[PDB]
Assembly symmetry: C2
């Protein structure tokens, strides 16, 4: 639905059968989740931002329910402080910015 931004935009997500809290982030190209165990094969790949680069594992065709809406895409797993839902997934659930 609609979400103001006075507080961190946190939502409930279901992935790999577990429930977690994730941040809807328009400033992230990709989706990166904390340490957890996922399906098939993966590859290295690195992501950057404020400070330095961190190593992540890339998983494709991963199902994920955000705030109750179905979606399938690429998910990254590495040493991140928080769960980040990027634009790759924010598009599937038709998430847009408005002002």
């Amino acid at each position: 639905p609609q979400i103001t931004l006075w507080k961190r935009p946190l939502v409930t997500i279901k992935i790999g059968g577990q429930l977690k809290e994730a941040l809807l982030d328009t400033g992230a190209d990709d989706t990166v989740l904390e340490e957890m165990n996922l399906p098939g094969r993966w590859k290295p790949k690195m992501i950057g931002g404020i400070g330095g680069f961190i190593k992540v594992r890339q998983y494709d065709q991963i199902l994920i329910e955000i705030c109750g809406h179905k979606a399938i895409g690429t998910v990254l797993v590495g040493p991140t402080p928080a769960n980040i839902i990027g634009r790759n997934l924010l598009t599937q659930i038709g998430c847009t910015l408005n002002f």
Copy 2:
């Protein structure tokens, strides 16, 4: 107005009399701009994210026009890869998320 997220949400901003490109980021609590010169006094303060922490300078009561909408608030200046418009300012222009 409305903005999809298939591409990085970039907008035109006017601050300190100069024109710059900035990213509207719902995943950022604060607003951090690249190296530039601003008004009054400032203080250290540090911000974190993916990788490591970076040093920034804090400036308050700074005017800033985003996509053409007026706003005044705190702006950070440091070694950042991009210009980031955080929730402190995204609220003033009434920016919300929708899906």
